[PDB]
Amino acid sequence: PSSVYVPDEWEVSREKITLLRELGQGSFGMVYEGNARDIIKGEAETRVAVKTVNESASLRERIEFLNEASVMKGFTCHHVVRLLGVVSKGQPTLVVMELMAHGDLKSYLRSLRPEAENNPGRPPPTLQEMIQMAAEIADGMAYLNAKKFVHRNLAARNCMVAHDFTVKIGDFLLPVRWMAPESLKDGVFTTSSDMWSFGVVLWEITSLAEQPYQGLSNEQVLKFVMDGGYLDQPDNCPERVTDLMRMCWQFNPNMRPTFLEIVNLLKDDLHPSFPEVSFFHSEEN
């Protein structure tokens, strides 16, 4: 493992980063809420998420932390959480990401339940909002597929929610309840198995983040899904999203839609800004 990171236009002066509070444990270590001065042209200050590697990390893990930041430089998708800057001079290394103020999608969904103690005084997602979420997630996944990344871990806990409620793909032992039968059987992960996970995300949206296969152990889920089992439809689930889930959960991975096919299905009734920001409508597609 050697440093591929070139201290370039992405390099941010450490003193430009002010840390406000802990947000929680990320993959590599603590994630902080921060404020960054003059990192984006036209903005004097930018709210940011700041990732760090935990103190127990090896030298290798620190190098791998910085190499991941280097990879993220190549991504410019509105529906994938974006890198803003890197502090690689001295320790600790800081990886500065766009802030997603409403946190992960699973927790956000669970907050909108009628019984929730942390309910923000708003109704649960409307059909329109759920379709919008689905399209945004699908577009972000379409982009990563075009970049030749198989996600392997798609779940509501791994999607993030912005200030304006835009949903984006976040960070990319086994999550068996989100896994396709062929992955459970042979450990084969493809964009087609990512599509299976996408259907589970739709199920999480329409159940306000219930635990998939509640009342079944992980061993029972493994067998159930490999045998051709899949999730039941949530109570009063909109027909349109039920239809998407059905496609996603075809046993033959060849018979599942692609992420571009999903966006295309949903494109005719989305927010006006969608074609201006999406990978789907971009010249890159």
Q: How many degrees, rounded to 5, is the angle at CA 204 between CA 182 and CA 236?
A: 115
Query: Please, what's the largest Cα pairwise distance for the chain?
Result: 56
Q: Where are the alpha helices (DSSP H) in the chain?
A: 59-72, 105-111, 127-146, 181-186, 191-206, 218-226, 239-248, 259-266, 274-277
Taking residues 160 to 199 in sequence order and writing x for each that binds ligand GS2 by CB under 6 A, - otherwise, the string is x----------x----------------------------
Nearer to ligand GS2, 24 or 272 (CB): 24
Residues that contact ligand GS2, how many (by CB under 6 A): 19
- Taking Cα atoms as reference points, which of 107, 197, 99 lies closest to residue 145? 197
Q: Which residue is nearest to ligand GS2 (CB)?
A: 24
Which residue among 36, 81, 134, 184 contacts ligand GS2 (CB under 6 A)? 81
12, 16, 20, 25: CA torsion to nearest 10: 10
Secondary-structure percent of the chain, ordered helix, strand, coil, rounded to 5: 40, 15, 45
Which residue among 66, 69, 96, 97 contacts ligand GS2 (CB under 6 A)? 97
> Does 53 sit near ligand GS2 (CB under 6 A)?
no
Q: How far is CA 160 from CA 104, 112, 137, 186, 202, in A?
A: 4, 15, 10, 30, 14
Nearer to ligand GS2, 35 or 250 (CB): 35
> Does 23 sit near ligand GS2 (CB under 6 A)?
yes
The Cα 189–Cα 183 span in angstroms is: 6
Residue 133 Cβ, how far from ligand GS2 at the closest point, in Å?
A: 16
> Does 87 sit near ligand GS2 (CB under 6 A)?
no
Residue 262 Cβ, how far from ligand GS2 at the closest point, in Å?
A: 24
Taking residues 115 to 154 in sequence order and writing x for each that binds ligand GS2 by CB under 6 A, - otherwise, the string is ----------------------------------------
> Does 109 sit near ligand GS2 (CB under 6 A)?
no
Binding window for ligand GS2 (CB under 6 A); candidates: 94-102, 137-145, 147-155, 273-281: 94-102
Nearer to ligand GS2, 100 or 142 (CB): 100
Q: Can you say how many angstroms the Cα of residue 261 is from the centroid of all Cα atoms in its chain?
A: 19
- Taking Cα atoms as reference points, which of 198, 209, 166, 171 lies closest to residue 23? 171
Helix (H, G, I), strand (E, B) or coil at 142: helix
Residue 209 Cβ, how far from ligand GS2 at the closest point, in Å?
A: 11
User: Residue numbers of the site for ligand GS2 (CB under 6 A)?
Assistant: 23-27, 31, 33, 49, 81, 97-101, 103-104, 107, 160, 171
